[PDB]
Amino acid sequence: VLKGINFDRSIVTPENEASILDLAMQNRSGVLDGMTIDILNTTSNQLALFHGTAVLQGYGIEITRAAAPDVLVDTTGQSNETMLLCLTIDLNQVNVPSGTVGTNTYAVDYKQIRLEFLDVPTLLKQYWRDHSLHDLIDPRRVISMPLYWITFGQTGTTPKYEQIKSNYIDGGNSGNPAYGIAARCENFNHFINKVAVQSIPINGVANRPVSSTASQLTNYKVWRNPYLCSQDPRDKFAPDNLVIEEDGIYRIDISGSINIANYTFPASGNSWRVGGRYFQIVCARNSSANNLAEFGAEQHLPPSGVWTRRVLVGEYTAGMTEQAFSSVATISLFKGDNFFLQFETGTNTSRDSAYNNGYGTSGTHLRNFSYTLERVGDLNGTAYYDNGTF
Amino acid sequence: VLKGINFDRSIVTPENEASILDLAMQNRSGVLDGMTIDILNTTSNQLALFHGTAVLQGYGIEITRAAAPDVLVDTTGQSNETMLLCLTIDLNQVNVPSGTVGTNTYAVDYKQIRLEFLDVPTLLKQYWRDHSLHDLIDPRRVISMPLYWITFGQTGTTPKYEQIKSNYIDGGNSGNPAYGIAARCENFNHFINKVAVQSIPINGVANRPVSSTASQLTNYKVWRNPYLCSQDPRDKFAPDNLVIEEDGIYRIDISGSINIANYTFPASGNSWRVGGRYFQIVCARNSSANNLAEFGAEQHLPPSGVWTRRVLVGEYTAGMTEQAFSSVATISLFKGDNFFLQFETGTNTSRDSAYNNGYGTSGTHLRNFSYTLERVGDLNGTAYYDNGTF
Amino acid sequence: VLKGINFDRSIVTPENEASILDLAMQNRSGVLDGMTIDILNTTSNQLALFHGTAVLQGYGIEITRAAAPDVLVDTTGQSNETMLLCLTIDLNQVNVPSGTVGTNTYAVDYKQIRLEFLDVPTLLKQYWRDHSLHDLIDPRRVISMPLYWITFGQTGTTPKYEQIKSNYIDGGNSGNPAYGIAARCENFNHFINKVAVQSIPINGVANRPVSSTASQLTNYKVWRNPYLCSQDPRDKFAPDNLVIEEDGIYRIDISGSINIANYTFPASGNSWRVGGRYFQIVCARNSSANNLAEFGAEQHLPPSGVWTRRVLVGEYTAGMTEQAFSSVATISLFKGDNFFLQFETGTNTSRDSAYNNGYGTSGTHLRNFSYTLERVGDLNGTAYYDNGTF
Ligand SMILES: CO[C@H]1O[C@H](CO[C@@H]2O[C@@H]([C@H](O)CO)[C@H](O)[C@H]2O[C@@H]2O[C@H](CO)[C@@H](O)[C@H](O)[C@H]2NC(C)=O)[C@@H](O)[C@H](O)[C@H]1O
Ligand SMILES: CO[C@H]1O[C@H](CO[C@@H]2O[C@@H]([C@H](O)CO)[C@H](O)[C@H]2O[C@@H]2O[C@H](CO)[C@@H](O)[C@H](O)[C@H]2NC(C)=O)[C@@H](O)[C@H](O)[C@H]1O
Ligand SMILES: CO[C@H]1O[C@H](CO[C@@H]2O[C@@H]([C@H](O)CO)[C@H](O)[C@H]2O[C@@H]2O[C@H](CO)[C@@H](O)[C@H](O)[C@H]2NC(C)=O)[C@@H](O)[C@H](O)[C@H]1O
């Protein structure tokens, strides 16, 4: 039959209001405030956490403040292991109320909520990002959110910790928690190596031209939303590649200029004409390596025929010392993919190369280069096949 | 007086929680999951639909699953007609509860909800996209959402169906259901016809240069959000024009290059200088034709003085084989408008044209062209006059 | 302990549903409909307001309609003063219910809600944009939203009014009330003054080239979201500067062309080659002047090392009559900042200037220039330091 959920004779249930809050959270779960580690109240037998609020698939969870320690987690038996401190909902448990409304003594022991230590494969099997209490095909009764990596030493020591920032709704994304900016940087300058194809380092270190003869590795301001992307965990790829943590349609914006651009000088032989040199800036995706996503999670397989390379800028050098460019594209990206930018040109500097024979500021380089990567759409349902291939 | 809705002594009503959910849905109504046609359980007297959830102006509607058929709709009397299968709320009806809380027998016969067949003019008069149960000036008591076009044959046959995808919140837009991408495509190449003004085909078929002498009509990947736009229903305009289904401020992004660009060769007569050729890429809107929107709905009239053409790129060819361009603009668009892109230049190839005398890859063409159209703002209230003219 | 808010044994309180609605409003408060001044029912002792709905930090407030006047505010004693008509929540007050559910006589006198006149410093101390009933560190019990500037004359006169549009959720932003477009304009043409550095007038008046000898100040279509930005209140800066009203990560899009661009003519002395002229378009922020934000509110101090200038386009003129450009960047902006765009070039027209010696249409000018400024992210929590410096 046709059932009303919100109608005059309907009864609004806990699962109902949780389904509503989850919708209002854009289906993202996470710590809204607090719930950070309290090292002052942390011993070799207990782990303390500060007061706070979290939402786990529409269910509101609170750690209350009193007198500190706001909450204590038992670490007895945990030793020489790296574990995940998790906030878990278990709907098989029974919440035990006591006292009464009428007296001011109503209280509930929420057995459906626990703070616990899980190993990575156990967390992954019940991770909110992959499984749901509200799921249509495989509904679950137990779901978890990892808060910290906890590394226990020898019996008698206090553990080392690392916050799982993807599960904290800190700042930057509050009104649009599942979307917004994935990555952005300030303008930077980067020397173009004398090769046909090279990646542009987008993760905060550029090879900056500093003199007429030299360039040097220099930091530039960069920011990443840990819920959406991360710097590649492999050192070979760490300067250049992002790992996508969330499927979606993303928008890539790039701008900058090619400085000391090469071209064939107008001479009597070529009828006093500039001989332009072709170059292209491409964005790229690659999913050959599995388990690059956070916790080594299984990558999300893309639809058959998915793009791998997309031309953002494709033209010739125009005979000027410096030539600006800009491009904006929407692209599909999947959890586990590598995403990167490449500069392409010919390798013969006297015929087809956009780069010259100089080094440092005398050599061809990218100047005032910057980008923004932003999540703008999801790939759920039919969009996976209709929108996911490009 | 000043009335609190959500305060300590307030009573939260069904209309209240529905007004809240509608706000959380960005005022969009639609099927959240399921509610697709079940052809196995569909006969010549009954039409079956699968279990699912929908939200209609903040009211949650559910089709429950048991044992299939999840729901049955009576088709007796319906013959040789094209009808709309609609999900309707009728607040003049009375929901009849039975049983009691205390026993586990409470149940409601939701007479305020029906699955019914309506003709197009009846649906349009009570369509959620134009009328509201919550409306300030003209509040309604009956509102509908069309799910399928149902074409009934002769008495004794099973009907033909077509899903109304604009009313299904499938994928791509989940956390931002009333906004997000309207249209996007992969990079494509398109031959420039030897004319002053031409539309750029944005609906998935381009005239691709394939040899030094020929171009051929070739499909490219394109995606449209049916809630926001559709391919023009008239075959004359179908390769080039979108029909806007929803008023708003939209963002248009374009990028690509002009390949084999024409220019006046540097000769002794012009003092060995490149003679550039002017061209422009414009976006355009046109509302002269009424009833282009879904169901032949009345177009939304724009404010007096509304724009019709906007220059996105305006410059000269620079004497290079290929020259890149990019542009981003925000524009107002109205339900029923045609939206399209045009390429403009002179027609004298020896004096003012950006195009040459070649064909296929030897002729001037757009290369690596792509666009994104996205809804970024609404045109309700004062924004209609202040923001709606440009 | 671990407390559930939305669980099976939980009791959902008024503060709970208000916290949920505030989340659904992206933490923005404001009038959703109506609540505009009713001058027909306004006298020298009373001020009338029309029926409407507002949300103040998740609490729903309603002015009910009956028979007009929908509500009356006492103005006795108010004279020769500029005051703020405010909608205030005071949780120290007690809402007084009367009658009963069972009879159809339940009614509440909402003493926790008032319409009142406050001076600017009192409003600022309890302004919802700076303080919260839900605040973690400094929770408040009294919070206000200003609706109108009310200027009272001599005893016996009806007052003058000015709507505070930043506190009315009118149109343009309904589904994304705290984000969306801040400012946008139609294409305009602007003469480039013969100077090294100049601001580009973004607030609706451009110096339009109209003849081969003259340019004239001409209006162009522009729109600003008053919640996000305003035209500079100082006449010296009013044509060029925006005042940012809300912290965040913003996206700036620019496009246009440089028409009648200057360059060194190819002559025998320079080996028949175009001598390009460097120019750059920069966006800029400046927070030296405090109290530029609405009501003269204290500016939000940026993190140490914050950017002030960012190159959007940096290149040489290419020897063409007209050269197009486009750029998209994300930038941090703070409440109280000035935001503006600048055009930069050399001042020697025979050696390094992108501008020539002409005036009007014969002189170098920006053609088809337009921009969009949009709020795309917040700067709360850790994002303030990690994302706020660029
Ligand atoms: C396991 O898959 C991984 O490898 C993908 C491909 O790597 C490129 O292939 C090699 C050689 O071409 C042949 O082995 C290069 O080392 C890789 O590309 C280079 O990466 C470095 C580091 O990021 C760049 O600085 C360099 O510019 C780039 N070289 C070229 C020629 O483009 C990789 O793309 C996958 O993402 C990854 O998982
Ligand atoms: C009923 O209004 C409809 O017509 C609008 C105008 O159509 C153009 O006008 C004619 C001729 O100029 C004179 O009759 C062209 O056929 C139409 O423009 C052309 O459309 C085709 C198909 O999309 C393009 O391939 C072609 O490039 C374009 N021609 C030119 C010169 O630009 C129409 O714009 C409204 O949208 C529509 O409702
Ligand atoms: C109180 O801080 C304010 O002033 C900031 C700087 O103003 C510029 O400085 C002077 C002179 O360079 C030296 O006093 C100029 O008058 C100001 O810049 C100019 O502003 C006008 C009006 O907007 C522009 O038309 C003009 O192009 C621009 N001049 C130059 C050379 O760029 C100001 O930036 C702060 O925002 C403001 O609060």
CATH number at residue B92: 2.60.520.10
DSSP string for A270-334: GTS--B--EEEEEEEEE--S-S-SGGGPPPPPPPTT---EEEEEEEE--SSSEEEEEEEEEEEE-
C194 within 8 A of C359, measured Cβ to Cβ: no
Cα separation, A88 vs A65, in Å, equals: 20
How far, CA to CA in Å, does A123 sit from each of A59, A79, A133?
A: 18, 19, 15
Minimal Cβ distance to C380: which of A71, A174, A323: A174
A119 and A234 assigned to the same domain: no
Q: DSSP label at C303? A: P
A55 and A44 assigned to the same domain: yes
Total number of residues shown for chain C = 390
Cα separation, A230 vs A223, in Å, equals: 10
Q: Which of B101, B94, B41 has its CA nearest to residue B65?
A: B41
Angular region, B137: left φ>0, alpha ψ -120 to 50, beta rest? alpha
Task: Write the CB contacts of B198 (distance below 8 Å, at least 6 apart in sequence).
Answer: B192, B342, B343
Q: Which two tokens stand for residue A170?
A: 């800190």
A58 and A181 assigned to the same domain: no
B341 and B360 assigned to the same domain: yes
- Which A-chain residues 104-123 have CB contacts (< 8 A) with chain C? 106, 108-110, 112-115
- The answer to whether the Cβ–Cβ distance between A108 and C4 falls below 8 Å is yes
The domain that contains C258 carries what CATH number? 2.60.120.1400
Task: Write the CB contacts of B295 (distance below 8 Å, at least 6 apart in sequence).
Answer: B120, B123, B124, B127, B146
Cα separation, B130 vs B37, in Å, equals: 26
Cα separation, C86 vs C30, in Å, equals: 11
User: Nearest 5 degrees, angle CA C344-CA C348-CA C351?
Assistant: 105
A155 and A182 assigned to the same domain: no
Contact status of C49 with chain B (Cβ, < 8 Å): no
Cα separation, C268 vs C32, in Å, equals: 70
B284 within 8 A of B309, measured Cβ to Cβ: yes
> Alpha helix locations (H) across B110-253?
120-125
Q: DSSP label at C101? A: B
A365 within 8 A of A209, measured Cβ to Cβ: yes
User: Nearest 5 degrees, angle CA A56-CA B4-CA C43?
Assistant: 145
- The answer to whether the Cβ–Cβ distance between C178 and A180 falls below 8 Å is no
In this complex, the chains that touch C, judged by 3 or more CB pairs closer than 8 A, are A, B
C127 and C183 assigned to the same domain: no
Ligand with the closest atom to the CA of C282: 3
User: Nearest 5 degrees, angle CA A316-CA A318-CA A323?
Assistant: 95
Q: Which of A388, A8, A4, A365 has its CA nearest to residue A210?
A: A365
Resolution in units of Å: 2.1
- The answer to whether the Cβ–Cβ distance between B18 and A8 falls below 8 Å is no
Cα separation, A73 vs A51, in Å, equals: 13
Of A151, A171, A191, the residue that ends a domain is: A171
Cα separation, A6 vs B134, in Å, equals: 15
Cα separation, B285 vs B308, in Å, equals: 5
> Alpha helix locations (H) across C38-147?
120-125
How far, CA to CA in Å, does C280 sit from each of C206, C256, C354?
A: 19, 13, 10
One-letter amino acid for residue B244 of the chain: I
Q: Which two tokens stand for residue A209?
A: 């031209």
Task: Write the CB contacts of B354 (distance below 8 Å, at least 6 apart in sequence).
Answer: B192, B258, B261, B262, B277, B278, B279, B317, B345, B346, B364
C370 interaction partners in chain B (CB closer than 8 Å): 329
> Alpha helix locations (H) across C46-93?
none
Of C138, C171, C204, the residue that ends a domain is: C171
Which residue's structure tokens are 């190369």? A353
User: Nearest 5 degrees, angle CA A194-CA A200-CA A206?
Assistant: 90
- Which A-chain residues 209-238 have CB contacts (< 8 A) with chain C? 221, 223
C130 and C209 assigned to the same domain: no
B204 and B215 assigned to the same domain: yes
E strand segments, B112-159: 113-118, 142-151
The strand pairing partners of B251, in sequence order, are B330, B374
- The answer to whether the Cβ–Cβ distance between C322 and B312 falls below 8 Å is no
Number of domains in chain A: 2
Q: DSSP label at B159? A: P
> Alpha helix locations (H) across chain B?
14-24, 120-125, 383-386
Task: Write the CB contacts of A77 (distance below 8 Å, at least 6 apart in sequence).
Answer: none
B196 within 8 A of B347, measured Cβ to Cβ: yes
In this structure, what are the phi and psi dihedrals at residue B296, rounded to the nearest 5 degrees? 70, 25
> Alpha helix locations (H) across chain C?
14-24, 120-125, 383-386
B271 within 8 A of B202, measured Cβ to Cβ: no
Minimal Cβ distance to B9: which of C18, C95, C368: C95
User: Nearest 5 degrees, angle CA A159-CA A164-CA A170?
Assistant: 125
Cα separation, B374 vs B225, in Å, equals: 10
B256 within 8 A of B324, measured Cβ to Cβ: yes
Range of the domain at B140: 1-171
In this structure, what are the phi and psi dihedrals at residue A24, rounded to the nearest 5 degrees? -65, -25
Which residue's structure tokens are 């503060």? C15
Total number of residues shown for chain B = 390
E strand segments, B269-380: 278-286, 309-316, 322-333, 338-345, 365-377
C155 and C205 assigned to the same domain: no
Of B111, B143, B171, the residue that ends a domain is: B171
B78 within 8 A of B53, measured Cβ to Cβ: no
The strand pairing partners of C162, in sequence order, are C149
Q: What is the largest CA-CA distance in chain C?
A: 101
Residues with CB under 6 A from ligand 2: B 197-199, 236-237, 240-241, 286, 288-289, 338
A389 within 8 A of A303, measured Cβ to Cβ: yes
DSSP 3-state percent helix, strand, coil across chain C (nearest 5): 10, 40, 50
One-letter amino acid for residue C280 of the chain: Q
Cα separation, C116 vs C114, in Å, equals: 6
Q: DSSP label at A159? A: P
B161 and B234 assigned to the same domain: no
C7 and C135 assigned to the same domain: yes
Q: Whose CA is nearest to atom 32 of ligand 2?
A: B198
Breaks in chain C listed by the residue before each, with C–N > 2.5 Å = 67
B124 and B189 assigned to the same domain: no
HEC states along B170-206? Answer: CCCCCCCCCCEEEEEECCEEEECCCCCEEECCCCCEE
Cα separation, A261 vs A259, in Å, equals: 5
